[PDB]
Structure formats: C-alpha cells, structure tokens
Amino acid sequence: VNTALQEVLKTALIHDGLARGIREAAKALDKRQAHLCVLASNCDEPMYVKLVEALCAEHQINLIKVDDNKKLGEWVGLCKIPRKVVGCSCVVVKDYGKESQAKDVIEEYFK
Amino acid sequence: PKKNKHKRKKVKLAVLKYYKVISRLRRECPSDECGAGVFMASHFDRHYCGKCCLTYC
Ligand SMILES: [Zn+2]
Numbered sequence: 001v002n003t004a005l006q007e008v009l010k011t012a013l014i015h016d017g018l019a020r021g022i023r024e025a026a027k028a029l030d031k032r033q034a035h036l037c038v039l040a041s042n043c044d045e046p047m048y049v050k051l052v053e054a055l056c057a058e059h060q061i062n063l064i065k066v067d068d069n070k071k072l073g074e075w076v077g078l079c080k081i082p083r084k085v086v087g088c089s090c091v092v093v094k095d096y097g098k099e100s101q102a103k104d105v106i107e108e109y110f111k
Numbered sequence: 112p113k114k115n116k117h118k119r120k121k122v123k124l125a126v127l128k129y130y131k132v133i134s135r136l137r138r139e140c141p142s143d144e145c146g147a148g149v150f151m152a153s154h155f156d157r158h159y160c161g162k163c164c165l166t167y168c
Contacts, residue, residue, distance in 0.1 A: 023126045027148030051130055058133065 004064065004105035005038070009076050011097050019092035020077055025052055028092045034061045036093035036106055038076075042069035043089075052090055064109055140165065 012018060019028045028034055029052065037056065043049065056063060066072055073079065073087035129150060130136055137150045140160035151160040151167065158167035 023129070026126065026129060030148035032147075049127075050132060051127055054132060 001105070003102060004109070005066070005075055007099065007102040008036070008093065008096070008106050009038075009091070011099065011102075012093055012095070013076065015095055015097050017093055017095035017097075018076060019094050020088050022049075022052075022090055025090050025092045026055070028094065029055045029059055029061070032059060033094055034059070034092045035096075036091070037061055037063045038072065038091035038093075039063060039065050040069060040072065040089040041065065041067045042072075049089075062106075062109065064106070 009018075019025060019034075025034075034056075037052065039052065040046075040049075055061075069087045069089060070085075072089070072091070073085070075088075076091055077086060077088055078084075079086065128136060135150065137153055138158065140146070140149045140151050140163060142149065142160075142163055145160070145162050149160065149162070151158045151165065153159075156168065159165070
C-alpha cells in the first residue's frame with residue numbers, strides 16, 4: 001500500500017526532514033544519517049547512477065523503491081496546482097515526526 | 112566596450128566525479144563546520160575547499 005509514501009513524506013517535510021537532491025544525498029550518506037531512501041527507476045537508462053545503490057552496502061541503509069519520476073516529484077517538493085514541473089530522483093529522509101500508524105511500514109520493509 | 116556579467120558555469124553531472132566506483136576521486140576537507148562528505152578541489156599547484164577557503168601545498 002502507498003501510505004508508506006503518503007503518510008511519511010507529507011508529514012516529514014514539515015519538520016526539516018527532507019534531504020532532496022542527489023549530491024546532498026551523497027553528503028547525507030557520508031553523514032551516516034540516511035534512514036529512508038526513495039530511489040528512482042526512471043532514467044535515460046538506469047545504469048548511469050550507481051552511487052546511492054552501492055553506498056548503502058557500505059553504509060547499511062533501508063531502501064524502498066519506486067518506478068516514477070513525475071509522481072515522485074508530486075510526492076515530495078513543490079509544484080503548481082504552463083505549470084512548474086520539477087522532478088526529484090532520490091530522497092533521503094533524515095528525520096520524522098511522531099507517528100502511530102506509519103512507523104512500521106517504513107520500519108519493517110527490510111526485505 | 113562593456114563589463115560582462117557572470118553566469119554560473121555548468122559542469123554536467125560531476126556528482127559521480129566526487130567518487131570512483133567505495134573509493135573517492137578527490138581529497139577530504141578537514142573541518143568542524145564541514146565534513147562528512149566535503150572534499151577539496153585538486154588544482155595543479157594547490158588544493159581547494161570552498162567554505163574554509165583552504166589552500167594546500
Ligand atoms: Zn574547507
């Protein structure tokens with residue numbers, strides 16, 4: 001179910017909890033402070049970015065996958081609702097709020 | 112003539128040029144306000160990190 005991206009990300013932007021972007025993801029992985037990693041599977045061909053795929057096998061990070069760039073850019077960050085299209089490709093969530101329905105679905109996804 | 116303005120220069124996807132794939136491709140900046148991912152640019156007779164404005168050699 002997709003409330004593992006609806007109930008954590010929209011409640012996570014309000015708390016200085018997003019590290020959105022790609023080089024900031026590399027500096028956040030070297031901080032050892034990645035707790036939640038939303039990848040991309042949308043690319044020109046996906047073999048061009050292998051750094052966030054391999055630095056978690058050095059750094060023991062949880063990974064949750066998605067297949068989309070534009071619905072990723074509609075999950076997190078800003079947009080007009082002639083429309084301001086930006087697209088996000090990798091998300092490090094650094095911090096959270098206090099949640100009682102959605103701690104587990106980001107927590108227990110270790111398969 | 113005229114004095115030109117400065118445009119932000121565009122290197123294209125240098126985000127993998129901070130690493131070499133495990134093994135980084137440039138050297139680290141020692142700092143307390145920086146660190147945990149902050150490297151120094153290795154020029155031909157000098158080595159440069161932005162925030163501390165540090166030159167090496
Ligand atoms: Zn420095």
